[PDB]
Amino acid sequence: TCQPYIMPPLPFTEWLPRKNYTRAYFRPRFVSPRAEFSSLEDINVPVLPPMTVLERGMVVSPDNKDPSLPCPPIIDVDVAADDAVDETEKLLFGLATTADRLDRLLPSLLYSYGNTKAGIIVLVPESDDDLDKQMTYFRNRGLDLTLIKSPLDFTARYFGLVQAFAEHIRTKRPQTTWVSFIDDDTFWLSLPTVAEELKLFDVNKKHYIGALSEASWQVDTFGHIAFGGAGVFVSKPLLDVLEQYYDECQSWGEQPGDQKLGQCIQKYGDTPLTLWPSLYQMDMKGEVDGVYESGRKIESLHHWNSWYTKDVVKMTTVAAAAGRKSVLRRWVFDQEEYVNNSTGKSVRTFWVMTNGYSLVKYTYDENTPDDAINFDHTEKTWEEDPRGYEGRLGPLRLKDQAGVTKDRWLLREAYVVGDNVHQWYVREEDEGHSVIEIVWLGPKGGGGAGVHDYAVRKQ
Amino acid sequence: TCQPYIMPPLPFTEWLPRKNYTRAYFRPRFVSPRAEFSSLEDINVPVLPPMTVLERGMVVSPDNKDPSLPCPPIIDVDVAADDAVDETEKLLFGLATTADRLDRLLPSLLYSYGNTKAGIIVLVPESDDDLDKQMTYFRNRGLDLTLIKSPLDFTARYFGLVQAFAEHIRTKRPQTTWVSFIDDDTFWLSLPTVAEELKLFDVNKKHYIGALSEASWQVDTFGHIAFGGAGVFVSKPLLDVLEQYYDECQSWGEQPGDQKLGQCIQKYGDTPLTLWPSLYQMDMKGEVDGVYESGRKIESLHHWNSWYTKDVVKMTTVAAAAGRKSVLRRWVFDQEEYVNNSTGKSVRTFWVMTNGYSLVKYTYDENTPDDAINFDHTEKTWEEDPRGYEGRLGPLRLKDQAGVTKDRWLLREAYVVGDNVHQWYVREEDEGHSVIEIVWLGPKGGGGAGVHDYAVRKQ
Ligand SMILES: O=c1ccn([C@@H]2O[C@H](COP(=O)(O)OP(=O)(O)O)[C@@H](O)[C@H]2O)c(=O)[nH]1
Ligand SMILES: O=c1ccn([C@@H]2O[C@H](COP(=O)(O)OP(=O)(O)O)[C@@H](O)[C@H]2O)c(=O)[nH]1
Ligand SMILES: OC[C@@H](O)[C@@H]1O[C@@H](O)[C@H](O)[C@H]1O
Ligand SMILES: OC[C@@H](O)[C@@H]1O[C@@H](O)[C@H](O)[C@H]1O
Ligand SMILES: [Mn+2]
Ligand SMILES: [Mn+2]
């Protein structure tokens, strides 16, 4: 009749209230890591069963006609397998932060760099802290990094990584070929994929890879630099030049280190900036739904714990079942039409799932055509003026478009239970607590997210 | 072959890092609701297996003696059944707060009052808000209340509940015979049990039931009143007297409403204050482990979202499987002894589980006796001066007692998966992330927490 019943994990914040609930099963099928999909893949089979009024727990309310939950279908989708972490060994990341900030952002740092072969050195302020004890605290939890005390300030310690990079490579990590400046809130959706894409650049030539800010006035203010929030990559030959002229470039005031880095490369590096539009600085505040639901290639995120608030750790939970590259992938399904037999015009309805972010139900009215939304255009949902984001984020759609209704279910909870990942999307409607659960039926032993790469730093 | 393996629900904050892990099973056998238990019930069989080093996810690390997780036993523990919610109908609770604060505290309010027969009226500030919409917003989620607009200020709205109570009882709730003043952070561990205990009072006589602050200086400052945060109970005959002298008592400044209520009863009520020590105002800051792990009869809690921080919603999650009365119940187990065959002295260890709060491993040194801790004496763990709390909280013990080591695993996560509740206790040790999981195997259909009282407010 049905298709073992998996019980949803429910915190009391979700178990206690009454809720309108529906669930769908998605079965990830892993293909090549180099496989490519559409920005919005279609599912031509019914997906979301009708909602069921539930009471405390999962008890079916007596308001429902059917006394039971609907039988949800299993939707097979193709996902690109995770890339190998072998190419990550050539990377050495550098941070200017504190051990307290590393501990607060530990889960996000574990997803980005944990269970990879990349090295991390951190310039921390001067203190009485036991660096060996703090280093063991993070390494035993899965984050192998090197803590180095520095007398410089945070702004100077950022550029001070140039000297820290060179000495660490010369003395401890000679196999390093790529060096990377990062913020502690620079979140990599798939670091091994980035390491694989760095192979296209000659390792023996100088290279300066980064991204511009999405806000045009930030580029006007600070110049065409690699904004440090999105991540910066500097090849070893360019680092050798930066070390040669470190004393001539390093100021000791409050100039942003990423701007100082770009100006030093512009002056003595003879290396142009290589632009990676997949790295996102996120120089924007408010609702970031448009960028996350854009279907664009997103390899790094930023500002998610300051300028705006977004649990990127909760968002990447699905990677344990469907791989890293499945995060923020878009599927469209459940297209329904409600025609008026007198006028012939119809109100159309369809769903778009941004994996790990949102479930959006779109309603086109009688006067709204089918192509009213180009989902390859980025919806402008943030606060700043949209004119400064047209150049970087392409042609922007309006947040409030006439004739279009956008009901959004934001991801509230996510849990890994065995081989499955339970996604708990929630919309707080006036008529109740609306819940949409997506259970990803991942393969045995895990679908990725570094679950098999625990001994990859050994020996 | 272990004694159907239940996979633990893991958020990415717990799935990503490496961790030292252990789990024990607890099967609550439900007995009579009036059954009493010791403040520290013994478990005489081994409970906690040896710790297993786990990598990312639940992968058994090669840094382990055995390649598999141990088979943990199932501990049978007697728990008292939840009381009936019939006696809650006589209660009418009054709040002086806003719809925004009700929304932020909705889960805790749902556990306290949801799925009971008690009424709730709230005096909210004047605004253009659609009161009927907000009422439907909370009622559809499980919290039925009446929102009344009031021009009075906050302190006046609290005592203004005297008029709001009398009018609501006379016109909408005539069956109300107990009226209760509460804060929005007044948390009830078992409201039906409190409603049952209120039957011990003659319902036709004036009654003023409350609790004094634990800090003696707060009583010296504001008097021997029923402190509002712990919850105040006023019988209907006393409310009639309070309404007769409302104008003579109600001021218009910033006098605390609970002190104003007590002073009005003192001047016109002719009713002494009946002290309930089980209601705790929680007039303390810092680590509140001593009160929560005291084994004392705790029926109301307060200040858990302001003066101190404690997710009382996560704490009561186990009540879905072991009943409301199991929360904060204590069990001691795993008494181990490590003697020295030369001197004969021994180092002894044992565990004390405060259900839903903490797992503490005590270590007594060679010169510490077995009676070194009276677990009926409240450990002084909060910030303020201990002398001000000796009267209310009995003889206190020191947080740092010589020869006694206290390693505490605090409750980090809690989930209800079908008939089971998973408790995720966490201690952040210098050598790694330490996790002890307790899986409560509740009975079929849920162990309580109002899972069967969903249709109890029907007409
Ligand atoms: O790797 C980092 C990133 C930031 N910060 C500190 O955090 C502040 C805010 O940085 P955030 O990343 O939130 O915003 P940004 O400066 O990137 O716009 C900075 O001014 C620094 O003082 C730090 O110590 N280390
Ligand atoms: O039922 C309540 C309780 C508190 N507050 C607000 O919260 C403040 C204090 O919060 P809390 O109740 O945690 O502290 P307490 O007053 O109990 O010491 C009050 O001054 C009010 O502004 C409120 O609006 N409604
Ligand atoms: O080079 C500075 C650059 O990092 C800018 O500084 C701040 O304006 C904001 O962090 C970012 O846009
Ligand atoms: O009646 C006043 C009483 O509520 C006291 O006021 C504050 O000191 C704190 O809320 C509590 O101790
Ligand atoms: Mn940053
Ligand atoms: Mn309060």
Author numbering:
A (entry chain A), B (entry chain B): 76 to 78, 81 to 536
From the reporting publication:
UDP-α-D-galactofuranose (UDP-Galf): β-galactofuranoside β-(1→5)-galactofuranosyltransferase, known as GfsA, is essential in synthesizing β-(1→5)-galactofuranosyl oligosaccharides that are incorporated into the cell wall of pathogenic fungi. In addition to the typical GT-A fold domain, GfsA has a unique domain formed by the N and C termini.
A diffraction dataset with a resolution of 2.46–2.37 Å was obtained for a crystal of GfsA–Mn2+–UDP and Galf complex. Para-nitrophenyl (pNP)-β-Galf was used in crystallization; however, the pNP group's electron density was unresolved. There were a domain with a GT-A fold domain (α-helical domain) that includes the central region (spanning residues 160–360) and a GfsA-specific domain (β-sandwich domain) that includes the N- and C-terminal regions (residues 76–159 and 361–535). The UDP, a product of the donor substrate, was coordinated with Mn2+ through interactions with the DXD motif (D260, D262, and H379). UDP interacted with W384, H380, and S383 regarding the phosphate group, while A173, R178, F231, I259, and D261 interacted with the uracil moiety. The acceptor substrate, Galf, was present within the depression and hydrogen bonded with D335 and D360. D360 precisely orients the acceptor substrate by forming a hydrogen bond with the 3ʹ-OH group of the acceptor Galf. In our study, the crystal structure revealed that the β-galactofuranoside had its 1ʹ-OH group oriented outward from the active site.
